[PDB]
Amino acid sequence: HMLWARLVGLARLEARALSKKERRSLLERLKPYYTRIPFSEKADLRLVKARTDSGEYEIITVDGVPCLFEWSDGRIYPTLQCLKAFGVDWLKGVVLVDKGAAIALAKGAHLMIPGVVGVEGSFTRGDVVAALYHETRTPVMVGVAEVDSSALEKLYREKARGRAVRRVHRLGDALWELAQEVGKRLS
Numbered sequence: 001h002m003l004w005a006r007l008v009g010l011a012r013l014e015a016r017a018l019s020k021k022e023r024r025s026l027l028e029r030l031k032p033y034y035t036r037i038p039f040s041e042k043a044d045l046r047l048v049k050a051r052t053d054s055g056e057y058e059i060i061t062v063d064g065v066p067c068l069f070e071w072s073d074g075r076i077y078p079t080l081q082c083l084k085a086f087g088v089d090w091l092k093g094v095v096l097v098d099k100g101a102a103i104a105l106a107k108g109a110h111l112m113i114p115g116v117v118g119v120e121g122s123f124t125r126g127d128v129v130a131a132l133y134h135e136t137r138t139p140v141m142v143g144v145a146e147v148d149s150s151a152l153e154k155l156y157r158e159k160a161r162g163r164a165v166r167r168v169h170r171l172g173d174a175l176w177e178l179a180q181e182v183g184k185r186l187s
């Protein structure tokens, strides 16, 4: 019925199961952007709508865990809670970042090339990737590669300037705070 999240505040909730049509559509829309769809064929998928003081948020829950969201580009992205639940191996790529970059990303910055200390997986410009703090492998941001993985390998090694990854969702953003609270309530 309602939750109260940090930053976002009071949210009035409505939840429902995805229809069979909605489920098939979701799977079709995920397939091109990820190595694997992380959840089981038998997972329970629900759509949660949360209305706060500023507007409406929509999250797809996977067995109750707030995992997926539609962005303004019309593509479906994982929450950081999804990456905790399912790991990161199912993404096309991961970018490892230094401490200064991890902190900046947690504040809401895009990821710049000099903050990159490694690249895992193979991906092209435009692909969905996650940025992880190298030391602990903590996911801090989910976003869109601005360069190919092979290009980024040479660019970070020379500490070239420019944007490596365009941020879509990050640790401590409004969606993150909402997802935290949905997860807390599930517990």
Ligand SMILES: [K+]
Residues within 6 Å of the ligand: 036, 037, 038, 039, 040, 041
């Ligand atoms: K799967």
